[PDB]
Amino acid sequence: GRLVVFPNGTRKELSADGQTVKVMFFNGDVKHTMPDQRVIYYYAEAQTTHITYPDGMEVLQFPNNQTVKHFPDGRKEITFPDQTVKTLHPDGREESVLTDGTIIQLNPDGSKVIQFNTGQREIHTADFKRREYPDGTVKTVYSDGRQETQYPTGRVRLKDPQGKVIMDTKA
Template identity: 70%
Template sequence: EVLHFSSGQIEKHFPDGRKEITFPDQTVKNLLPDGQEESIFPDGTIVRVQRDGSKLIEFNNGQRELHTAQFKRREYPDGAVKTVYANGHQETKYRSGRIRVKDKEGNVLMDTEL
């Protein structure tokens, strides 16, 4: 079944329960029967939402970001990984092996330089 709305939105409903929604800006959202969602934005960014609420964002510049109830983590193309925990603490791991930890105010608690 295909539904066309006056706003330009198009919804496709598939027999297996999937839904594909195309918005006027050409963003495409796929809704799966098990509760997962995937949104593909015109700039190439992809957002996947799992049943548990965690979210994986893949940016068109190669960066990836994972959001959970406990933390948000961004992975950079150069190998660096920055994690911000629910309590505000930040941990950055660099490709070199260096690790920097900051408290929620941004004060450095630990910095290992190799």
């Protein structure tokens, strides 16, 4: 049950059972250090809880009920109250998994990819919006209005903006 009061008012007190080292900082921050070396830190101003594990993993819990987990591999995973999980990868990719299973990926090249739970995949770039279907069919609409269908057979059919076929090839 040791107690140290530092000249600045910060208190360090061991729990009655000897297991938790509790620091109450003069600014209202509180730190608990556990036997397994887990550190739990409450930031009073931000009202945020920050847990640091021995392996270096960190988890933050914010007032708005968001959680952010920092993984040793460099990923940062943000969980929203509604169950949406957003992962930030080291390469700059951001992938959100919605509660219905939909995946929305934001890529460092400007593109947005949506993977629907039906297998269908939508790719949006500055130059086109493309839909890929599980069988191998691809429909691409260009910013200029041209439309290309690739069939799983190798056939590629291209149409002008009015829908007139201007190219239809197959090997």
